[PDB]
Design an enzyme around this catalytic site. Structure first.
Site, PDB file in Angstrom:
ATOM      1  N   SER A 122      15.012 -18.667  75.908  1.00 63.31           N
ATOM      2  CA  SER A 122      14.591 -18.199  74.558  1.00 63.31           C
ATOM      3  C   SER A 122      13.075 -17.972  74.546  1.00 63.31           C
ATOM      4  CB  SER A 122      14.902 -19.178  73.462  1.00 63.31           C
ATOM      5  OG  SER A 122      15.787 -18.576  72.553  1.00 63.31           O
ATOM      6  N   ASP A 154      14.372 -15.169  63.243  1.00 66.29           N
ATOM      7  CA  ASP A 154      14.233 -16.257  64.191  1.00 66.29           C
ATOM      8  C   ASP A 154      12.883 -16.236  64.883  1.00 66.29           C
ATOM      9  OD1 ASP A 154      14.756 -18.428  65.934  1.00 66.29           O
ATOM     10  OD2 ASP A 154      16.714 -17.652  66.755  1.00 66.29           O
ATOM     11  N   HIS A 165      14.027 -21.581  66.468  1.00 67.06           N
ATOM     12  CA  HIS A 165      14.965 -22.616  66.954  1.00 67.06           C
ATOM     13  C   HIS A 165      14.379 -23.429  68.093  1.00 67.06           C
ATOM     14  CE1 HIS A 165      16.703 -19.244  69.479  1.00 67.06           C
ATOM     15  NE2 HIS A 165      16.843 -20.201  70.409  1.00 67.06           N
TER      16      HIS A 165
END
Length: 151
Positions: A102, A50, A28
Site C-alpha cells: 500500500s 483513502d 488505512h
C-alpha cells in the site's frame, strides 16, 4: 521520494510518496512515516479516496515524483516487476502483492507515476489492484477497486 511507514517493532506496513508538491499516503496505513521531518507534518484526510497528505517541505519539492494521466494499455513498472494495463484494470500476477505494498507507485518508462496502490483483488490468475489515480480535468483523483483486500 520513496518512504516507509512502520508499526510497533518498526514494521513496514506501507509506503509514503513525495509527489507533485505533496506527501501522499494511504490512510488505512496506520503508522508513522519514517523521516524526522515528514513525520512531523499536518496531514489532511480524504477518505472518499483513502489518501492522507501534507504539503512538501519548501525544498523537498524539488525531489518529487511527477504524475501522468496518459495510461495506455501495456506494461507499467512496480517494485515487484511488470504491471499490466489490462483494459482499465491494473494487474499483477497472483501471489505477488500484500503487506508492504500500500503506498508504492506504479510508473511508466519515462519514470512518471501512473497510480499508487492501496490493495488488490485476485481475479483468477492475476490480482487486479485498488488504484488511486487522477485524470486530466484537474487532479481528479480516483479510487478504483474490485471486491478487494486492502493491504
Amino acid at each position: 521520494r520513496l518512504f516507509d511507514v512502520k508499526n510497533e517493532d518498526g514494521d513496514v506496513i506501507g509506503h509514503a510518496l513525495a509527489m507533485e508538491g505533496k506527501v501522499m499516503k494511504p490512510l488505512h496505513v496506520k503508522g508513522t512515516i519514517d523521516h524526522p521531518v515528514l513525520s512531523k507534518l499536518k496531514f489532511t484526510k480524504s477518505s472518499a479516496y483513502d489518501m492522507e497528505f501534507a504539503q512538501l517541505p519548501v525544498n523537498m519539492r524539488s525531489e518529487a515524483f511527477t504524475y501522468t494521466s496518459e495510461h495506455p494499455e501495456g506494461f507499467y513498472n512496480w517494485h515487484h516487476g511488470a504491471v499490466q494495463y489490462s483494459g482499465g484494470r491494473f494487474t499483477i500476477p497472483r501471489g505477488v502483492g500484500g503487506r508492504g505494498d500500500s503506498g508504492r507507485p506504479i510508473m511508466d518508462n519515462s519514470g512518471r507515476v501512473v497510480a499508487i496502490v492501496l490493495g488488490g483483488a485476485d481475479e483468477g490468475t492475476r490480482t487486479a489492484l485498488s488504484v488511486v489515480t487522477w485524470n486530466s480535468k484537474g487532479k481528479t483523483i480516483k479510487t478504483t477497486p474490485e471486491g478487494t483486500e486492502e493491504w
